[PDB]
Structure formats: C-alpha cells, structure tokens
Write an enzyme that holds these catalytic residues in place. Structure first.
Site, PDB file in Angstrom:
ATOM      1  N   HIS A   1      -7.526  -6.299  -0.438  1.00 59.15           N
ATOM      2  CA  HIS A   1      -6.286  -5.504  -0.364  1.00 59.15           C
ATOM      3  C   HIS A   1      -5.084  -6.180   0.276  1.00 59.15           C
ATOM      4  O   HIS A   1      -3.960  -6.042  -0.232  1.00 59.15           O
ATOM      5  CB  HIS A   1      -6.630  -4.218   0.388  1.00 59.15           C
ATOM      6  CG  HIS A   1      -5.516  -3.239   0.520  1.00 59.15           C
ATOM      7  ND1 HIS A   1      -4.938  -2.667  -0.588  1.00 59.15           N
ATOM      8  CD2 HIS A   1      -5.017  -2.647   1.633  1.00 59.15           C
ATOM      9  CE1 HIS A   1      -4.030  -1.811  -0.122  1.00 59.15           C
ATOM     10  NE2 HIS A   1      -4.048  -1.760   1.209  1.00 59.15           N
TER      11      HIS A   1
ATOM     12  N   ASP B   1      -9.734  -5.186  -4.973  1.00 63.25           N
ATOM     13  CA  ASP B   1      -9.173  -4.308  -3.977  1.00 63.25           C
ATOM     14  C   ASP B   1      -9.914  -2.976  -4.077  1.00 63.25           C
ATOM     15  O   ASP B   1      -9.831  -2.305  -5.111  1.00 63.25           O
ATOM     16  CB  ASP B   1      -7.677  -4.137  -4.291  1.00 63.25           C
ATOM     17  CG  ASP B   1      -6.911  -3.367  -3.225  1.00 63.25           C
ATOM     18  OD1 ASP B   1      -7.555  -2.559  -2.481  1.00 63.25           O
ATOM     19  OD2 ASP B   1      -5.672  -3.507  -3.168  1.00 63.25           O
TER      20      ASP B   1
ATOM     21  N   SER C   1       0.828  -1.239   0.000  1.00 62.17           N
ATOM     22  CA  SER C   1       0.000   0.000   0.000  1.00 62.17           C
ATOM     23  C   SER C   1       0.873   1.307   0.000  1.00 62.17           C
ATOM     24  O   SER C   1       1.710   1.443  -0.893  1.00 62.17           O
ATOM     25  CB  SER C   1      -1.016  -0.059   1.138  1.00 62.17           C
ATOM     26  OG  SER C   1      -1.992   0.947   0.940  1.00 62.17           O
TER      27      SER C   1
HETATM   28  C1  LIG Z   1      -2.297   1.816   2.044  1.00 66.42           C
HETATM   29  O1  LIG Z   1      -1.414   2.198   2.799  1.00 66.42           O
HETATM   30  N1  LIG Z   1      -3.394   2.521   1.728  1.00 66.42           N
HETATM   31  C2  LIG Z   1      -3.769   3.576   2.678  1.00 66.42           C
HETATM   32  C3  LIG Z   1      -4.485   4.712   1.960  1.00 66.42           C
HETATM   33  C4  LIG Z   1      -5.690   4.176   1.189  1.00 66.42           C
HETATM   34  N2  LIG Z   1      -6.362   5.261   0.464  1.00 66.42           N
HETATM   35  C5  LIG Z   1      -6.264   5.766  -0.795  1.00 66.42           C
HETATM   36  O2  LIG Z   1      -5.522   5.505  -1.719  1.00 66.42           O
HETATM   37  C6  LIG Z   1      -7.354   6.803  -0.534  1.00 66.42           C
HETATM   38  C7  LIG Z   1      -6.831   8.224  -0.526  1.00 66.42           C
HETATM   39  C8  LIG Z   1      -5.666   8.552  -1.207  1.00 66.42           C
HETATM   40  C9  LIG Z   1      -5.184   9.848  -1.194  1.00 66.42           C
HETATM   41  C10 LIG Z   1      -5.854  10.829  -0.500  1.00 66.42           C
HETATM   42  C11 LIG Z   1      -6.994  10.512   0.202  1.00 66.42           C
HETATM   43  C12 LIG Z   1      -7.481   9.217   0.190  1.00 66.42           C
HETATM   44  C13 LIG Z   1      -7.520   6.088   0.856  1.00 66.42           C
HETATM   45  C14 LIG Z   1      -8.849   5.364   0.883  1.00 66.42           C
HETATM   46  C15 LIG Z   1      -9.241   4.559  -0.178  1.00 66.42           C
HETATM   47  C16 LIG Z   1     -10.472   3.928  -0.169  1.00 66.42           C
HETATM   48  C17 LIG Z   1     -11.306   4.052   0.924  1.00 66.42           C
HETATM   49  C18 LIG Z   1     -10.914   4.822   1.997  1.00 66.42           C
HETATM   50  C19 LIG Z   1      -9.697   5.482   1.976  1.00 66.42           C
HETATM   51  C20 LIG Z   1      -5.297   3.032   0.254  1.00 66.42           C
HETATM   52  C21 LIG Z   1      -4.554   1.952   1.022  1.00 66.42           C
END
Ligand SMILES: *C(=O)N1CCC(N2C(=O)[C@H](c3ccccc3)[C@H]2c2ccccc2)CC1
Length: 294
Positions: free
Chosen positions: A268, A238, A121
């Site tokens: 995921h 995912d 991630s």
């Molecule tokens: C792994 O570490 N991640 C954590 C962050 C998560 N994520 C995104 O990508 C979304 C995002 C990205 C940039 C700004 C704001 C939000 C969040 C997210 C995705 C789907 C649902 C809730 C939050 C991906 C996995």
C-alpha cells in the site's frame, strides 16, 4: 475579564507556537510548509491518509520543494496534531472543505500560481473530491494508492457491521485495526509506522467506517466530473486499496491527461516501500510535476 488558557494540540502544545489554520467548525488544524528559497513555480497540497498525519510526507515534500514548488499540508481533523475526537468526522465533506479553505488561503498569499494536490489512501479520495468540486481550478493531482474501492473482503465484513450500527444506537462500536505488515514490504517502514505516537493504530470506529463508505460512494459519482490531470500510482498487492479501484479510476475519470503506473508485488504505502519502488515513486512524481510546471 481575562483571556482563557491557550488552545493546545491533543499533545498539549499551544497552537500559538505552531503553524495553524482554524476551520469552519472552529477547530484548529496543525499546518506544515516547505517553501523554496526563490519564487515558487507552483503550490502543492499534500493530503495524508487515515490514521496518519502530515509529518509522514517530509521526504516527498523536500523533493517537491527542491523542484521550486511551495509544498503545504495540514493534519486532517481527528488526526495528528489537529483538533477533534480521534478518527471521527461529522461528514466526510469536512475534509474536503478544509483542504479548500487552506488552498484558498495559500492562493491569497501566493497569487497567480498553479495548484496541485497529492493524496495517499483516504487523502487521495479527499484529493479526488476536492478537484471534482472545483473543475478546472487544479493543475494536477498525484494519487498514491487512493481510496476508491475498499478491499472486497474487508468491505463486505464492514458493510454488514455498519448496517447494525445504522439500525441501532451503538456509538463505541469498532472493527479491528489494520495489520501493519500489509502496509509495506519494507519492514523498517512498518516498524516506523508502529513507533510513531502521532499515528492512530486503534480499530476503525464504525461511524468513521461509514464516512469512508460515503467517500467511496462520492468518488464513484464524481468520476464523470473529474477532468483534472492526474498521475495514479498503485501496487498490485495492495490489501487496503484494491488495485481494481485504480483501473476503474483510469477508465471512468473524464480527464484528458491520465497516467497509471502499477508496481508489481508492491503493497500500500508506495512512497515507503522497498527502495527500488520508493525511488521510482519519487522519480515519477518528480518527472510528472516537473513536466507540468515547466
Ligand atoms: C487509507 O487511508 N486507507 C484507510 C482505510 C482503509 N480501509 C478501507 O478501504 C476499508 C474500509 C473502508 C470503508 C469502511 C470500512 C472499512 C479499511 C480496511 C481495509 C482493509 C483492511 C482493514 C481495513 C484503506 C486504506
């Protein structure tokens, strides 16, 4: 004059009792090591995702150490047992800078060894940026559901809220937390995630969400410079890191040695998914790193 009280983790454990590293900002990072009994064949840094911590990689690290690699990790700033305001970063590059300091420190203690990165991630976006900053330095990279493209429905919802904090002074703003059920089809692993007190399950602070959008931007610009060998593991279902990002990474990376494996129906956290998926993930990483350390 007397020396001040020992610096402690956010869980009140003195850093003097734990493996640690002090970063360029004077912040203590909690460290983990898994070393084989013999001379290691290679080093591998494990880079955790947002809200979690290095302790979540125990089983993967033990598998890698079983291949005679010396595995090492730290909790990123603002996470787990490292210092910093929870899930806050001044700039996303701090994470990449700190991985590089730890890698540089380990290569002094164990010289002449190939070094690999393993990221999940946000940790996979950190691994990509780390390898792009040092072309030709890393032997390989293993990416598990790397953050390259956020989920389209959540990226649009955030980018609007983000341009409201970007135009005004709203420091405490936060979006909603991740629905833990989308992490994995393995309900026991979802319950374990929900039970770990070192995991931050609060909603994403808008300032941190901005840094994740910076990470995605930087990953896209780095792909023409990315030449490191890599294995990319991605679940087709995912909801956090959309699989479209994994296909784009295979296409736009310049690497001569790139492989993608898609886990059909998987969520995921592929290394904590249904046993058939998790066993495959461990086996594929084992074969891939074994082939590149022989
Ligand atoms: C792994 O570490 N991640 C954590 C962050 C998560 N994520 C995104 O990508 C979304 C995002 C990205 C940039 C700004 C704001 C939000 C969040 C997210 C995705 C789907 C649902 C809730 C939050 C991906 C996995």
């Amino acid at each position: 004059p007397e020396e001040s009280s020992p610096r402690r983790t956010p869980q009140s454990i003195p850093y003097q009792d734990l493996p640690h590293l002090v970063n360029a900002d004077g912040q203590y990072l909690f460290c983990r090591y898994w070393a084989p009994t013999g001379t290691p064949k290679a080093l591998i840094f494990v880079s955790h995702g947002a809200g979690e911590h290095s302790g979540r990689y125990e089983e993967l690290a033990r598998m890698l150490m079983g291949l005679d690699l010396l595995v090492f990790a730290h909790d990123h700033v603002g996470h787990g047992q490292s210092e910093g305001e929870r899930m806050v970063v001044s700039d996303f590059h701090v994470f990449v800078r700190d991985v590089l300091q730890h890698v540089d420190s380990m290569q002094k203690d164990y010289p002449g060894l190939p070094v690999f990165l393993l990221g999940h991630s946000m940790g996979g976006a950190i691994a990509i940026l780390t390898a792009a900053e040092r072309p030709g330095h890393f032997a390989g990279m293993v990416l598990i559901s790397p953050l390259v493209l956020a989920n389209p429905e959540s990226a649009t919802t955030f980018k609007v809220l983000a341009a409201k904090v970007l135009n005004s002074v709203l420091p405490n703003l936060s979006s909603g937390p991740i629905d833990s059920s989308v992490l994995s089809r393995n309900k026991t692993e979802v319950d374990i995630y929900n039970s770990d007190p070192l995991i931050c399950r609060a909603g994403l602070k808008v300032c941190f969400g901005i840094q994740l959008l910076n990470a995605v931007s930087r990953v896209e610009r780095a792909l023409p410079k990315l030449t490191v060998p890599f294995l990319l593991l991605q679940g087709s279902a995912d909801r956090l890191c959309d699989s479209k990002g994994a296909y784009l990474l295979m296409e736009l990376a310049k690497s001569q040695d790139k492989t993608l494996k898609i886990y059909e129906g998987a969520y995921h956290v592929l290394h904590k998914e249904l046993p058939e998926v998790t066993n495959s993930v461990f086996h594929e990483i084992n074969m891939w790193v074994s082939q590149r350390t022989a």
